[PDB]
């Protein structure tokens, strides 16, 4: 068809200029002349798009298409003397339909200035090696003979090198192997052997609580997850009980020494577990199952304090609403546990360290619950209704958070 601009827009323009009482044939005469000039320029701006080898366009093809038709490039003002603004363009006007049309000059200075990129640089790679396209990141994607393994000996040697580097004898070797896991596109069809190596490892690595072996395997899990190419939820049924035990298990190794390390490992386990519930989500299978196991870990009495601290951390890192609903009716039990560890003269065991870590973590989570959906007031002795664990020091932490909010 031949689509033109509407004539009922051309009469609005004419009567808002001082030219009143225009006929319909006078008004139809305006909207076929200007609709041709739009069609003449958009067909002529198409020349610059096809010779600019882009199709997408950069605000500027219409600026050269106008200059080609001996009409000035600038829009929003027309100079009848032509001399200060010749056919050089001014880049158009950054205007919108949902524009407020009113702005504060001070706000524009306040708004941050964007950074400037490195200048264009030249980088060569390989599309084809003697006919075959390589999988580099610059590329898009009764006697009978014995069977041949689908995995290659380069791939099997790669698996052996990556697994012997990921057990962390040297740190630079680990870090590359972790980046190699994080971005190898062909790491599918090797993924059963990696999942089995992880799963089997943690289970025979908690027989003796070897913390590095576990911290390296959890970093291997994290490096497996952020790889975008591979399909993981076929293997998550092996991945999730491995991270579960890491968080909810006792430490064969004494903890007064690496419990800080152990705590860090638990945090890593709780980070990956929250990611494992963020992805791979279907109805009522994964997130609710680990939530139920965490809550019955919490509810059961006389539970190892290492297991208690790990389950507390796992319950805490589950997001905004989960602590808004699951960390409310239980403060009295937490306080009673802290009071029991406090009473009595035996500190040799790990029960006291576990108690201090659990109380600190629970108190910080309470702080956003106090900040997110409550107003501060009576920060001296009202917390004694919650067994008086953090009290005024908790109030001081809340005040520091308020100061950080003021700085923001």
């Amino acid at each position: 068809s031949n689509t033109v601009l509407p004539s009922e827009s051309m009469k609005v323009v004419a009567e808002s200029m001082g030219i009143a009482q225009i006929q319909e044939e006078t008004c139809q005469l305006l909207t076929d002349e200007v609709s041709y000039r739009i069609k003449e320029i958009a067909q002529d701006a198409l020349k610059f798009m096809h010779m600019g080898k882009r199709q997408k366009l950069t605000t500027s093809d219409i600026d050269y298409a106008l200059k080609l038709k001996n009409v000035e490039p600038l829009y929003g003002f027309h100079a009848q003397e032509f001399i200060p603004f010749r056919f050089a363009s001014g880049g158009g006007r950054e205007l919108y339909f949902y524009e407020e049309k009113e702005v504060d000059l001070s706000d524009i200075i306040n708004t941050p200035l964007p950074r400037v990129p490195l200048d264009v640089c030249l980088k060569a790679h390989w599309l084809s090696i003697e006919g075959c396209q390589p999988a580099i990141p610059e590329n898009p994607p009764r006697l009978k003979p014995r069977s041949i393994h689908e995995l290659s000996v380069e791939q099997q040697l790669y698996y052996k090198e990556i697994t012997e580097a990921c057990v962390g004898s040297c740190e630079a070797k680990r870090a590359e192997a972790l980046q190699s896991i994080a971005t190898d596109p062909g790491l599918y069809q090797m993924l059963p052997r990696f999942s089995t190596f992880i799963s089997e490892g943690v289970r025979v690595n908690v027989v003796q609580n070897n913390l590095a072996l576990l911290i390296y395997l959890m970093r291997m899990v994290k490096a497996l997850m952020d790889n975008p190419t591979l399909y993981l939820e076929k293997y998550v049924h092996e991945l999730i009980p491995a991270v579960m035990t890491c968080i909810v298990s006792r430490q064969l190794c004494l903890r007064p020494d690496v419990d800080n390390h152990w705590a860090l490992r638990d945090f890593a386990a709780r980070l990956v577990a929250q990611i494992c519930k963020h992805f791979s989500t279907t109805t009522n299978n994964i997130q609710s199952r680990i939530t139920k196991t965490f809550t019955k870990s919490w509810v059961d009495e006389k539970t190892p304090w290492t297991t208690r601290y790990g389950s507390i951390a796992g319950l805490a890192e589950l997001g905004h609403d989960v602590i808004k609903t699951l960390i409310l009716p239980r403060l009295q039990q937490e306080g009673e546990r802290i009071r029991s560890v406090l009473d009595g003269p035996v500190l040799s065991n790990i029960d006291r360290i576990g108690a201090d870590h659990v109380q600190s973590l629970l108190l910080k989570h309470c702080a956003p619950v106090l900040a997110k959906l409550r107003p501060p007031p009576d920060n001296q002795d009202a917390y004694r209704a919650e067994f008086g664990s953090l009290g005024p020091l908790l109030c001081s932490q809340v005040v520091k958070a308020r100061a950080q909010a003021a700085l923001q």
């Binding site: 049924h237 009980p241 298990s249 196991t293």
Partner: peptide, 25 residues
């Protein structure tokens, strides 16, 4: 939709806590 392979995925049919040995023989 119950015919979808997602229902037959091992993770949906497998309980992780039961799978963990937890040093149990």
């Amino acid at each position: 939709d119950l015919l979808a392979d997602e229902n037959f995925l091992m993770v949906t049919q497998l309980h992780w806590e039961d799978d963990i040995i937890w040093d149990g023989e």
